[PDB]
Structure formats: C-alpha cells, structure tokens
Amino acid sequence: FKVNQFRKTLRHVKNIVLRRKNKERSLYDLTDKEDNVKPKTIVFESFGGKNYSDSPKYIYEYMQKYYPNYRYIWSFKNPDKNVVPGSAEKVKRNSAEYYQAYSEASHWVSNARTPLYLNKKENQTYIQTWNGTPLKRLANDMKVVRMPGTTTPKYKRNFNRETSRWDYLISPNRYSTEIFRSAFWMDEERILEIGYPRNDVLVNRANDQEYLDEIRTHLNLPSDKKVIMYAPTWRDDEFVSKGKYLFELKIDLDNLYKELGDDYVILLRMHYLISNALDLSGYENFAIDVSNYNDVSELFLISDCLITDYSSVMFDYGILKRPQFFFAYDIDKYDKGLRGFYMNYMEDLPGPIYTEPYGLAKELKNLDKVQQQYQEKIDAFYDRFCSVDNGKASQYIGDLIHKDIKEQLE
Amino acid sequence: AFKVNQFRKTLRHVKNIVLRRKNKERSLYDLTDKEDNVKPKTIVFESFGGKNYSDSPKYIYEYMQKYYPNYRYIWSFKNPDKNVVPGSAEKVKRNSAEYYQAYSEASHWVSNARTPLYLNKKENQTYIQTWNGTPLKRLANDMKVVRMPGTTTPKYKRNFNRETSRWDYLISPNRYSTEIFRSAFWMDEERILEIGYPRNDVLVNRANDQEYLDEIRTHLNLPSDKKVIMYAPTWRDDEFVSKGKYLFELKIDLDNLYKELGDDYVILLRMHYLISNALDLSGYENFAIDVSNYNDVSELFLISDCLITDYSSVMFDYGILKRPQFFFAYDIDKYDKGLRGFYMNYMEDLPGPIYTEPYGLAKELKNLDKVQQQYQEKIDAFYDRFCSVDNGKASQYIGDLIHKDIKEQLE
Amino acid sequence: AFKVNQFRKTLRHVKNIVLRRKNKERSLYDLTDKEDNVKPKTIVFESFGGKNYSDSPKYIYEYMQKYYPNYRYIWSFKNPDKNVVPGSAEKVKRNSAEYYQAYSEASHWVSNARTPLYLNKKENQTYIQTWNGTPLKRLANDMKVVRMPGTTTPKYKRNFNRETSRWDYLISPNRYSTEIFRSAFWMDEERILEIGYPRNDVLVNRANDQEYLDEIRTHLNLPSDKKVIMYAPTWRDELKIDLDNLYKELGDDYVILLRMHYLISNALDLSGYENFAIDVSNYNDVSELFLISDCLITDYSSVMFDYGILKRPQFFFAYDIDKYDKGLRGFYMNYMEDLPGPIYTEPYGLAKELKNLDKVQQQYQEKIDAFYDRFCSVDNGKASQYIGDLIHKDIKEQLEH
Amino acid sequence: AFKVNQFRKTLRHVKNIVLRRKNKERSLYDLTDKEDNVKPKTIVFESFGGKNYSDSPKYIYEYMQKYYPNYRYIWSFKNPDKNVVPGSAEKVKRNSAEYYQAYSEASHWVSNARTPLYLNKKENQTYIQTWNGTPLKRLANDMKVVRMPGTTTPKYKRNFNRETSRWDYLISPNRYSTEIFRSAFWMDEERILEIGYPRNDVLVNRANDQEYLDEIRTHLNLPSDKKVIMYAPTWRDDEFVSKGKYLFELKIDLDNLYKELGDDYVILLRMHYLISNALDLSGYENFAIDVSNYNDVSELFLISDCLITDYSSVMFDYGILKRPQFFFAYDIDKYDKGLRGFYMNYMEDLPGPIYTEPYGLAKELKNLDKVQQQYQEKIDAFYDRFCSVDNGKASQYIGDLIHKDIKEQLE
C-alpha cells in the first residue's frame, strides 16, 4: 500500500464525509490512471473556460471539418451559456464529467494556464497556444509580484510548474519565441513558430466580402461609414464608486462625435467592468459598445484603424497593414523610461503616440494621409511581428494532433 | 451532531501515525487535549524557544522555587541533556510526548518569546508573556515589509496576531514600551504589567554585592587590576561571507584596542553565535574574552564598567546601572540615513556618543571619568525614561501572581 | 465533549477504505447517517432478507401503489436484476451504497423478517414488522437450545431482542399468536396489530374470482381435468412420500404441486412425472398456489394456518414424528390433538385416504371449523389496507410540524 | 510501503491510546514484538494463569536456581505482591508493560496451563508445557459438548488447538496420558516427554525425609499421636446456593468421622476455594483442619496415610506413594450413569473401593492395614499403569533441557 495513494485516499474520505464540493476532484486524483486515455478524445478550453473563442476555437473548427470522427469535448465555467458548433459536447469545470474529459483525453488544447490539480500524464499531449505576442514582461521575467495571497518566488514556482507540462507552445514570431524561451522556462525544441490560429482569418478572409458584410450587419452598422476600433487596456487608478458611474473616457466621445460622427463609427472594446458602467445615450449609431462580442478577430477585419495603448492586440491587428494610433494619456505614470516592456515603445510601433485626444481626432479625419505618412513604420512592424502568419496555423495544429493520434492507435 | 473538528484531527492523526511522521506526537496531543488535563499546581517555563535556561523565565522560576517549593515545575528545551536547571523542575525536550503533556497539564505557561501556534491555550490556562526587551527596531504590526521566505507580510502579521491574542499577561519595562506593545502586538493595556523585567532584578538588587561580582569575574578567569569593556553589536547579514570560515577582523579593530587599552582594560565580546566560532582571538589572550556563550547576560552587565553597542535593545537594560555607553554605529550610513524605523530618535536621546569609526571611541575610552561626567545628563535622562520602573521585585510580582492565580483554582 | 462513538466509527471506516474492504459502503453510512437524512415520503420494502418480491410486503406495496402513488418507493434485493417489480418503485442491491442511502433516507421500513442490526433505526423512522406466519414451533425467546453455527443460545437471543425492540409495529394473525409474540419477541401488546397478514388478502377477496383462478393455473400449464394436491414439507438437514406410488394411486384425478426447499428442489429428477408432479418451488406468490389448491399436505409448518382460511382439507404427513422428541412440547399448540386433518407417518394410507376428498371434508368439518375459528377468524383481507393507511397517516403527521 | 497486518495493529493501538484503554499495554507489545527482542538467558514461569507460585513450574524453577543461578528468571502473577518467590527471579503483574517485556524477551516459557493466544510465541522461543495431570475426564478435543457461554464448542476447540500447536514440549506422566494427549491436544508424539511431573519429585525423593515430614506437620499445628487422612472432593455446581453464605455440611458427615476416627485420626480437608471460606469447622478443632489454601499439595500427600476423593486427577499423583485410596462418590448415579465420559474404567481399575454412603467408609477406615492388604493388589496394579514413570528427576530433566537449549542459542 503506497504512501502516495494513502495520502490521496485520506484526502478523499475527508471530502466525502465532510461533503466538501471538492470530492469530485479527490476521487479523480485517486482513479486517474494512464489507462483511461482514449487516444481519440480531445479537450478544448479557452481563457480558463469562460468562452468558446480564440485559437482553441479555430483549431476546433478546423478539426471538425477534416476530422469529424473524434471525441470533441469543450470545457466551460457555465456550459449552458455557451454555444458550440459541431460534434463537440461540453462539460462544467470542476464537475464529474470535467475530470473524466481531462483524464480520458489524448490531447489538451488551450490558450491559458490550465490548473495544476489536473494530472497531465506522460500519456497525453498538452498543446499551448497561449494568447499573444507579449508587450508586458510575464512569468519569469517579472521583477516584483505583490499579488495577494502569494509571494513572488512561489508564484514563479507554480508558473514554472505549469509550463513544464506544456508539450507544445505556439509562437507568432521570433521575438515572442526568444521571450517565451526565458519567460516560460521553455525549450526551443517544444516551440512552434506558425502564428496564431485565431489570426488565420486576418490572412484568409480579409478580402472576403460576404463575410465582412455579415459581421458588419450583425453589428447593425451604418453602411457609408468607416470604422475605428478603440481598445484601451485596463487600469486600476480608474475604478471608483464601486463602478456605478465612471468619468467619460479621456478619448472624449463628445469631441469625436463632433469631429468624425459623419465619416466614422467607433467601436469601443472595453474591459467588462468599464463596459456595463458606460453610458452611451446620445451616441447611438456613433459609438457602439462592442465589449462582449465573442470574436475579436472579426472586429479587426472590419476596422479601418485601431486605437490602443499598451496591448498585445496591436501585434494582431498588424497583420492587416492598417494604421494604428496609441493614445497613451497616462503614459507619464508608466515608469518614465519603462524597460518593463520587451520592445521599445518610443521607437518602433506602427503609429503615432498621442497623449491627448485632440491631435488624434484631427489626424483621423483623413486616414489615407496617415496610411502614407506611416507606411514605412507599419511595414517595419509588420515585418518584425506579423510575417510568420501563414493563415495555416489552425490547420498545422489540427494536423499535428491528427498525426499524433495515428501512432497511439496501435 | 457530527463533531467535524474532531473528525478532522482524527484524520490528521491517522495520517501521521501510518506514515511514520515525526509529528504523530503533535496530532495525538491535539486530538485528546481536553480542558480537564489541567492541574492547577503545574507550571511550564521556556526561554527563547527553549534554547536556554536564562532570561526572565529563569528568574521567575528561581523565585517561585524558594517560596513555592510545593508546585510542579517543568522546563522545555530543544536539548534537555545540554541544559542545567537548579531546583526541583523536570525537563521536557521540545516536541516530545512529555512536552505536549506538560503543555496540556499546566495551569500556567511562562515564556519570553512566541510559543508555537500548534500548542493549544485552553481558557483553562494562563499564558504569561515576559517578552524580551524594550524595543528599538519596529516589530510585528508596526513593520512595513517582511520579505521573509514562504510567507508574506500580511500572513506573517496574521500569525503574530494569533499568538499575541493568547497572551493573558504581557510584561512592560516602561511607559514607552507599553505605548508600542499596545499597537505592535495588538494588546489591551488591561493585560500589560509595567513592572520591569524579572531579569533585571539583579541590576537593582545586586550591583553592590562585591562577593557576587567576584564569582562572575572569576567564573570568567578575569585579570584582577583591569577594568571591563563589554561589546555587544547586533547581527548584520551583509557581513557574512566565505561560509563564515574566516571573517574580516571586527571593525572595532581589536589590534588598535589592545595597543590603546591592553594595559588597563579587558574587553568582553558578546557576539552572535556564528561570528563567535569564527573569531581568531590568537594574540589577545587576557584582553579579548569571548563571552558569546555565557548563560546569563545580566551578570555580564554587572561587572561591566561600560558598554559598547549600536542598534540593540540591550542598551535599555544596561541603563539601570547608569554607567557609560558608546554606540559604535559604523554602518549607520547604510541605515536609511535619517530614519524613524526606530521607535525612538536614535540620533538624539541615547545615553552616549555615536562613533562611526573605532579610533575616536578607543581614545575616549582611555578616560572613563571624563565620559561619565560629560554624558551624565544624557545618562540620567535616559534612565528617567526607560529605567524608572525596575525595583528588582519583578521576579517576585510574577510568582505571587502565579500563586495567587492558582489558590483561586483550588476552590 | 469527545464524541467517542464517532471516533470508533471513523477508525473502522478508515480501516475499510485502506484495506479495500467490501464493507466500506457500510462504515461510510455508519459515519454519516443522521436523523436529517430522512425524507418523509420514502418507504422501503424487503421480504425474506431480500430474496423475493413476495408476500406481505409485496401486498402492502401493491395496495399503496394504487392509492398513494406519489410517495417514493424502494425495494431491497439480494439481486435486483433477477426480480421484476410492478410500478414506480426503484430497486436496490443489498450492501450497495444505494441500499444504505435508502435505509438512511426512508421514513418507514416495511419487512417480514429480521433486518440487519448494522442498519440504524432512528428515533425518527418507523419500522413496521409483518413477520411471516402464525408460529408452530417455538421461536425467539421461548427456545431451549440453539447450538446454531458460531453462536451461543443467549447471544442469539440477545441479538434477537435487539432486533425485536426496533420493531415499531408488529403484525398479528390471532390472539394465540399475539400471546405468543408478546413472550417470544419481548413485545409490548401496544405495538402489536391483530389484523391478519396482508399476504392473506387474496385468500378471502379473490377466493371465488374464477377468471383469476384460471390465469394462475394456465400460468402453470396445469391439466384441465385434475384436482390439485399441494405438498409443502418444512426443512430438514427420492421423496419420503413415494411419488412412484402417488402416481399409481392418484394419477387419474390429481396432479400434485411440490413446494420444497431450493436445495432439494434441483435434486428432484421429476422425469416420468411430468404432467403429474409439478415442481413449483421457485414460484413467487404462495397464496396464489393455495387458491387453486384442493387440499394441502404439510407437516410442521406455519403454512397450515394460512391455508386453513380456505376451510379445505389438510393432511399432515409427519414421517419424522418419532425423531422429534417423542411426545413433543416444542409446539405452542397440541399437535397430536387439534389440527384440521389426519396425521400420517406412512405415505401409503395417506394416498388411499386422499383418493376421495369429500369423505375427508365431512370427517373433519368439525375439526376444520374449530381451526378456522381459532387461527383464521381474524383475517379480513383488509390487512394491506390497514397497513397502507397506517403508513399514510403516519407520514402526514411527520409532514406538518 | 506499509504491510496489511501492521496497519491493522497500528490502528488497533491508536484506538487504545486515544480511549485510555487498559489494553494499550498489549497493543504496543503487538506492534513492537520482534523475533529479535529475545535474550537467550531469559526464562518466564507462570502457573495456573498467575494464580500461584506452585507445582511443576515451581520445582523446575527451584532446581534451576540451585544449579544455574546465572540466568534471568521471571515469574508472572495476577498479583505479584500476594506471592512469595524464593531466589533471584523478578516478578511481573499480568498485563503490565513489564509482563509483555518478559514474554517478548524470553527464550523459554515454562507453564502448566494454557497461556493466552494474544501473546506471540515467536519461532524464536521455546514454550514448554508441563500441564497439570493425568486425565480422568475428557479434555479439549475429546470433549463431546460444552455449552460455555461466550463460546461455542467448535470455537473452543479451534482456540485450544491454536494454543497446543504452540507447545514445543508436552510433559507426560505415563503412556496412558500420552495416547490421550496425542489425540485430545492434537499432539505429535515427537513433542511429548514422558518424564513424569516435576511436582511429583518430592513424592519420591522425600517420601522418607523425617526431618522434613515433621516440618510440614508442625507448620500445620497437627497433633503428635495422630494419623492423617486427606479429603479432596472435586467441585460440583449442585452444592452452590444462597450467595455461598451458608453451605450444607459435607456429605461425608464430619460429626460421624469425629466419633469414629477421632481418637486416632486427623482429617485434612482440601476443598474448593469457595467452599473453604464458607465452611464452619467450629467444634472440630484438632480433628478437621481446613487445608484448602495450602501452597503445596505435594507436601500434603507426603504426610497422608490415605486419601479420600472422588472423580479427580489427584488420585494419580497420590498413586506414586502406594497408599490406600477411597473414593467417596456419593453422587455417582447423577454422573451420567455408567459414564464413558471418563477415559479409564472407573468401576474397576482405581486402587480402592467406591463408597456412596460415608458410613461404611468411616468404619472401613478404622483399620488402614486391613485395607492396605485387602487392596494391596489393586494399589500395585494402579501404580504400574500410572505411576511407574516418575524418576524423581523430572524437574532436573526440564531444567537441563532448558540449559542445553540456551547453549546453542548462545552464538
């Protein structure tokens, strides 16, 4: 009677007798043996099961088409509030079926850390797409982490533990690769430079019009109007009053309305807390709240330019060689010269840094002029970051997985 | 009615017993610890996490032994075979089956430091915390960062709070410390006992006891015509290098010290244990005495004509003697410059000269009458503030509190 | 406040979990079983330690199913898969976790034998015991010796006493029985219910329902032309009755049903007796057999009281009446004197006598009635009702405060 | 990592520790009992389950004292206090820590009745079973039916058989017993040692030691000019009534015996312990002497001129002396008629008459020499069948087998 089993065993009796909600887990930890793995089961979860979205979605939609005959399982916080096309069946996180799915599967696909209490056996292949070309230092590369409940050495310890299990790790470029290699204690061997499966549409579908037209009318958009997308990153300094009434975005909608309300419509992609605290009465058909829209890649395809600040998205939107603007209004707060960025913000991004909305508004009046004026820099940026993207990524993984599970079938 | 907390313990205990864990003794303690095992006549002592027989618990014990021989005394140690206790008390080793018994049974716990959180203080038992000194560096609640491993500033304070909340009485040296303790240790003034330290009763009761002074001086093979400097620097992390095999000679420069005072003085080195077995006192025999391992620091104080220190709470204890004090604070540059991470204004109201190099100090030390005269005011005012409390009856107060506390129980 | 029973149940349960013991199911239930677990509308049934869907619990249940259909019904079986149950009732396998959940939850236990002492009967649940017939041999307390396997007479009685005290209500057939129960089972008459046995409903209500009789007989493939003799020995440690002879004697008017013991049943090579001797041991409702039975042959069995309700003839073929303590008092009633039929120790004159049933009927009509009037004058066929109701009423009170 | 059998004990012992159970002493023993605990020169004696210091164990031990005073001898008692042991031996109270230490450490076990199944006779130790006498009633296996509450017949035998399989050596006093033991105890003849009983030594070596006979007689304050009769009825349940407060005078009728034998006899009454403390011998002073509580029955025999008894194993021990026996079997009809619940044929091959009324017994008893003669024939035949195997050296034999065993175990 082995000491490791005895421990798991007592823990479960505790959970069973005490009616702990965790019993579902302790039972799993016990019975989870290498033999439960059915070589043709695949589980997908995206952003820790809040969504059917991002690269796991596109890897899934590719495999549905060309490999219908596998068990496809999706993992969700609230399965019944998530709509999935196809042969996939869904599971609630932390439930009986959840641990089954994860025990049986030959392959794990996801774009974020999956929990450590989940047992990744030698048997199974865990493929990590992750969720973007980094601009802020992550994991190992961070210096201090005053994050509640844990120290920094511990938080790195646990991260290091997750990444050690990543059999494959996708990368959108050389620069992300070099970073991952250190940030995620990764081996170049295990890294796949192919680009993001979720970016595939940015290459394949950008000139598809019936498609652009759906997305546009699914959003009820003006027909004559060009589209600006605004997508600021989150900031604590701006959460006040429990989040009931916020101070109008510093971008100044009133102004943008006056200045561009006739040529443009503007898409506000905000953090969910800002979203449902944002009053847009008086801007109908001008500023559209687009914060809860399922698929961000679709929003990029219909955008004529992106306004952002410090985001992993500028790297995505780059694939389309369109104009970007960076409205870093609080940029002085951010550490004076901040090396807490991998890249050189001041120097090499595809657009102007504005710190005030009004130069930004004038500039927007005439896009074609910004496109020319910055064509040089857009290109340099496209070369450095977005050139790796075939439009073939979701196919490459779907095939890697297919090839993978032909062997196990013996 | 399912008893869920009991079930929990039974499981931990089974786990330990089956797995051959050393803590089987602890989990059994916890499972069975009934409020009934308390026996009014039993008292446990330990000082400094049970490394010693020393400090205030020692002096409380030796008092009660003389007037209250009748009670059951227990001392807890890390290593009992290496510690000698006068009197009737029995000695338990920490974490041992006997140790948990002692703590289960005692009506009274007496220590000068934190006792573990796994021990249970039943409402049945009185925990008397003497603590261990008038504070200079800010402690517990009043800190600002605890970059100390496995644990964060908040969970460190959380645990400290758990501990201080089991203190039935806490001993205070002066109004100053009381102020602090209230905040730093989240304490009720109701529970504070401004009486001075049972360990400084010898600094009041026995300064003029010329025979007792001699024991101490001969216990330490001291040359006879020589006056005595004691040196007691706090521990510095920085100054540790090379596995601690050879240290760069103390910055107080013994060699100069010899050449200036080798004739008239002898100097007692109260170093931290790691520096102490790294000292090379070859060539200073009969001048530099190691005294790091001396059982009773207060006895040292008694035979010391002056003290050199820096950022320690000992200056507060040695104050009762109204003797000279020097603060060789050489590394003060690298201590926040103008800092208030000390409760009191270190730059102004200590009882002596601050010296950043040892040469002005060494010279100064030639003439001890000129110092005493010079700083006498700074010295008297230091005393009026931090030492106006000790009447040398601290040991007595506590034993009578214990005995009074326990008559009650016998009805 | 050290809960010491709890502490023992935990250790036992941990010992089970670790040494992969089958009883882990049970020690879990013992730990967790609480009064709150009880749901007022859950009822459990088991007959004969869970081998059948049969007699008094079956009838109680078949009644309750028809009138109070919205309660949660559960049946306990040694093997649920080999037992068909009518209605909404779910089945549970003994010692399975569903078994314990079920006895823990249920507000009423209904059975006709002893239920295990490792099951807990709370101050909260109501255990209705129907037992299983009007006694002939002494049982329970009244016994003298029981050198039975791995148990001393008293420890056997200590444990009987333990069970019988859990009994909330205990069903009686006759004052004779009640006076016997009160002593045998340590019972207080307050808890006794002289209302007859529910399984003997049919033996009164459908005693003339011909179309029903006809389904029973053809559910058994019986001769359209013969009278039916039922032979129901009681258990002992070719047949004594001489089949070769009964055939030669009664082949022309009778066919004979043999209801033996499962282990003697599948040792009976009834070849050359097909269409005459019908093994009927593994049949379910014994009451249906009585209904189609023209007379009964038994010996020392409590079925003789059930069958008497029909006022038909009985023959007692007691071949081992010698090796039964000569003049035996081990019988609550006087066996040699008052019973509704002739005692035979040889099966040969039993046969001749049995050739014409009607001489026997008259020759014993006085004795037969005297029997009906002592032991059967209390069976109203309303019994299933009375219980079914009692339980229904019982779960109203406990569904109000 | 952990084996099933050890887990089970571990858990049993936790149950005993937590529940302050008297049996914790045992649970420990069972966990900690190693084949390695043994010390070859430790020997444990216990007789009649620790009731006594007595028969075979005593004499084997007393012999091993004189000739091997060098070993560790331990005696086991229910109450070590109420028992006096001569010699080096230390004593131990059954079920104390000491007690299990003893049976754990001992190379040899000497006993005359069953020792508990819960003690582990390691493959390392030699359990020598002397037993307590030639059977007349059927035992263990041959017993037909036993309604002893708490256990069923087959359980009883399984449990006896477990215990006999633990015996490395079974002493026998005759072939009669050997053929019996072989069956009744499930014995392999290899293990049986017909050497006679060590308690019977003195019945041979000392039948004539007049300085010694006298020492017994005068330890009992026996008259000078008077012969000794011994009576030794076995116990009967029938006679127990009324809290055992007031019994009915013996069937043997004392008042008669006094009238008849008085001027020439004194009668030693060896009754059951319960009949003794209930018997009123007032007015019979100097005639009937209560002798129930005597530490050594063999001494009693040495001094008796004859021995009245009934259905008892003692007739065989007395047989050695070739003296008259009577059998006052006053309830012989009750006892299973012509019972075969005995081994030997009762109505024939015992060395004296069977009386059922005690009045002919008494008269016949008036002239011993007529009986010694009229029955010399039956006495000698009896002596041959049952007593012609006692060298007087039984304890020496055992003593020396033990010594031998612990020479080889010494390497």
Ligand SMILES: Nc1ccn([C@@H]2O[C@H](COP(=O)(O)OP(=O)(O)OC[C@@H](O)CO)[C@@H](O)[C@H]2O)c(=O)n1
């Ligand atoms: N050959 C038989 C005997 C009995 N039974 C059924 O089992 C019950 C018990 O009858 P007994 O032969 O006496 O068996 P026993 O378990 O000893 O019951 C007798 C005692 O319980 C009276 O209270 C009967 O009422 C009858 O319904 C049956 O199907 N076939």
Ligand SMILES: [Cl-]
């Ligand atoms: Cl192991």
Ligand SMILES: [Cl-]
């Ligand atoms: Cl949901």
Ligand SMILES: [Cl-]
């Ligand atoms: Cl993540």
Ligand SMILES: [Cl-]
């Ligand atoms: Cl893992």
Ligand SMILES: [Cl-]
């Ligand atoms: Cl990222």
Ligand SMILES: [Cl-]
């Ligand atoms: Cl973490």
Ligand SMILES: [Cl-]
């Ligand atoms: Cl690069």
Ligand SMILES: [Cl-]
């Ligand atoms: Cl706004």
Ligand SMILES: [Cl-]
């Ligand atoms: Cl418990």
Ligand SMILES: [Cl-]
């Ligand atoms: Cl006390």
Ligand SMILES: [Cl-]
């Ligand atoms: Cl030690």
Ligand SMILES: [Cl-]
């Ligand atoms: Cl000591």
Ligand SMILES: [Cl-]
């Ligand atoms: Cl301090």
Ligand SMILES: [Cl-]
């Ligand atoms: Cl130095």
Ligand SMILES: [Cl-]
């Ligand atoms: Cl309910």
